[PDB]
Design goal:
heterodimer; A: Penicillin-binding protein 1b fold; two-stranded antiparallel sheet; globular; B: 121 residues; alpha+beta; Ribulose 1,5 Bisphosphate Carboxylase/Oxygenase; six-stranded antiparallel beta sheet; 6 strands; 24% helix; UvrABC system protein A (chain B); Transcription-repair-coupling factor (chain A)
Chain lengths: 85, 121
């Protein structure tokens, strides 16, 4: 589970999702994918209706925003998002 | 001086401890137009923040640029504290891909302070 203003390791997450079976892509489209652009990590949790875009300031999560897969554009902010092992 | 990405990452980080810097991709520089197309294209690439005439902006709801005014637009690729590496060398690679091979780092706290310009060549 992930919250706004929660500190954490960028590289720890990435190898973690790899092992959890998530795919690293250029552009997040469907379930079980993640993408990286600088400060940003796009993530589509398995089972979640809506994908999430996390803004990293250094090691802290500045914002968790929902985004639409087709436009690739940021919708409203959320305070937290969960994750399935 | 036309550095490697390793060399760029090294001039940043050679910077005063705990100073907050932003890494930027120059998109368009000092050019008249409304730039509705790049501003739209940047949003579609997935980026969120941009620096537009020296203001930081949400790319989901950009400011409207005057047709007949000179504008300059940069993406904010990354925001970091100066302690890593690794993660920065990526972030630079990414910035270098948004412009054609340039990158700019700027003090987040003091906008009148000098900026670092890197060029991948």
């Amino acid at each position: 589970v992930m919250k706004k203003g929660q500190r954490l390791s960028r590289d720890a997450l990435r190898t973690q999702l790899d092992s959890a079976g998530y795919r690293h892509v250029d552009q997040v489209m469907e379930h079980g994918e993640y993408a990286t652009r600088g400060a940003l990590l796009d993530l589509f949790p398995m089972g979640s209706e809506l994908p999430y875009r996390l803004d990293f300031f250094d090691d802290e999560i500045d914002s968790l925003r929902v985004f639409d897969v087709d436009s690739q554009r940021t919708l409203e902010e959320v305070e937290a998002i969960n994750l399935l092992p | 001086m036309a550095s490697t990405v390793s060399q760029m990452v090294d001039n940043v980080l050679s910077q005063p401890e705990g100073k907050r810097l932003m890494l930027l991709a120059p998109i368009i520089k000092e050019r008249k137009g409304e730039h509705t197309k790049t501003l739209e294209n940047l949003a579609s690439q997935g980026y969120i923040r941009a620096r537009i005439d020296g203001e930081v902006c949400d790319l989901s709801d950009p400011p409207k640029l005057e047709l007949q005014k000179k504008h300059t637009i940069e993406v904010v690729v990354d925001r970091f504290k100066v302690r890593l590496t690794q993660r920065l060398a990526e972030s630079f690679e990414t910035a270098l891909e948004l412009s054609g091979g340039t990158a700019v780092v700027a003090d987040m706290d003091d906008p009148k302070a000098e900026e670092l310009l890197f060029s991948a060549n």
